[PDB]
From a paper:
Rspo (R-spondin, also roof plate-specific spondin) proteins are evolutionarily conserved from fish to humans and have well-documented roles in a broad range of developmental and physiological processes resulting from enhancement of canonical and non-canonical Wnt signalling. ZNRF3/RNF43 specifically targets these Wnt receptors for ubiquitination and turnover, hence reducing Wnt signalling responses. Direct extracellular interaction with Rspo proteins inhibits ZNRF3/RNF43 activity. Here we report a molecular level analysis of the ZNRF3/RNF43 ectodomain structure and its interactions with Rspo proteins.
The ZNRF3ecto crystal structures revealed a distinctive variant of the protease-associated domain topology. Two β-sheets (comprising β2, β1, β7, β3 and β4, β5, β6 strands, respectively) splay apart, accommodating an α-helix (αC) at the open edge; two additional α-helices (αA and αB) pack against the β4, β5 and β6 face of this distorted β-sandwich. A disulphide bridge, conserved across species, links two structurally elaborate loops, β3–β4 and β4–αA. The crystal structures for apo xZNRF3ecto, zZNRF3ecto and mZNRF3ecto showed no major differences in the main chain conformation. Comparisons of ZNRF3ecto structures for proteins crystallized in several different crystal lattices, or for crystals containing multiple copies in the asymmetric unit, consistently highlighted an acidic region (N105-E114; residue numbering is for mouse sequences unless otherwise stated) within the β3–β4 loop, the short αC–β7 loop and the extended β1–β2 hairpin as flexible elements of the fold. Our crystallographic data provided independent structures for multiple copies of the ZNRF3 ectodomain in eight different crystal forms. All but two of these crystal structures reveal an extensive interface (average interface area 992±109 Å2) formed between two ZNRF3ecto polypeptide chains. This dimer is conserved, and pairwise structural superpositions yielded r.m.s.d. values of <1.3 Å (for 275 equivalent Cα pairs). The interaction is twofold symmetric; strands β3 and β7 of the ‘subunits’ abut face-to-face at the core of the dimer. The β1–β2 hairpin forms a second interface by reaching out to embrace helix αA and the β3–β4 loop in the opposing subunit.
Numbering used by the authors:
A (entry chain C), B (entry chain C): 53 to 205
The structure:
Amino acid sequence: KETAFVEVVLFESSPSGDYTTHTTGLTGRFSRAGAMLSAEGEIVQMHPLGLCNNNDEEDLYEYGWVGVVKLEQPELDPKPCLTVLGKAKRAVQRGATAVIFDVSENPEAIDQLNQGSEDPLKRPVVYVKGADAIKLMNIVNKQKVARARIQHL
Amino acid sequence: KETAFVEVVLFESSPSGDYTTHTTGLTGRFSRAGAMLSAEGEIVQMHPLGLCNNNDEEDLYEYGWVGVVKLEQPELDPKPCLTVLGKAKRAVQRGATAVIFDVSENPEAIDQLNQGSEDPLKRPVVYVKGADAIKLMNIVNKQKVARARIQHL
């Protein structure tokens, strides 16, 4: 639906106490399964098979993380553990302040999500594609310790 | 100037992996020294004498914290280390994603801040008073580990 401006911040401390930052802006869109809210947190890269309640608890994630999930070619998962819409549920259920899906290689996700007017989540679910997704992932993949800032309207 | 809706979240983990939350909403206003942006982070209680470059570096704060400063009666600080407007600068300079001043006992702060159209900060500066400030502080003081969510418009 409405636009989801997203900033990604890489940050190093300097000896002089102060932080340095690089920062990259992405456009994204807000799903109807999520709340159309601003939100901000440390980015966590969730494995699409890593958001599975097949396993009870994975590791510790401190409350308030931005969960980023790079979606797979649907063809390559016939037998999943969780819906696109119930993966979001669990991350949120587990501290995520926002969820971000790179649906580049699975655009049907959009609909499943955007036809989610049955019990939507308190926290935002955002999807990205195109050149906007390329960046994110090139940042998440290559990076480690990065903070996302998702703004609404 | 414009309103700054602020949520304060207390959060505990449950054995079952999931978080529980209590949450309290405050109204605040956005200073002209800050950016009128949404922002979110772990709340840190900065001492008004604790935001002093009299001391070079204090302790480690991970980038992205919401700095909360409860302002003193001006009468009780004739000889300060930093302006209201340069205290904000340093927190921001040191990772703060937002700054929050309880100006209850020092409303002049407002002006000093709101007459800050000379080189304003990338990150938001919010002030609160009244029943809105009472809450925050009653939460910060009594609490430990709490997350703030500041929304614009």
